[PDB]
Amino acid sequence: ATRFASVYAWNRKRISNCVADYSVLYNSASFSTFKCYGVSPTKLNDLCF
Amino acid sequence: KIQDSLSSTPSALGKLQDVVNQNAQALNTLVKQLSSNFGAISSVLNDIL
Secondary structure, three states: OOOOOOOOOOOOOOOOOOOOOOHHHHOOOOOOOOOOOOOOOOOOOOOOO | OHHHHHHHOHHHHHHHHHHHHHHHHHHHHHHHHHOOOOOOOOOOHHHHO
16 A cells, blocks of 8 residues: 555454465565564464465 | 053153153263363364364
8 A cells, every 4th residue: 555544543444355475465575563463473374274 | 550650640650751861961061061161262172273
């Protein structure tokens, strides 16, 4: 997104009914901190939400 | 009288119904504990792994 919503009125974009390529999240290095609760921070591709 | 009492009255066999019921509850309770979270992020073992 070019511009995001502010922290008090933060946006909420629900995603459903498609294939989620988590590879672009797992292999990326531009993410300074990926400190990830709940599930493993790398192998996201092997779950269905 | 035994034939009629046992066929009619369901609680007549309570001494045996309680043992079968305790075993059904013990196993059903054990499986519901397999459905219990116990403080973990999830109760389901395949999803945890």
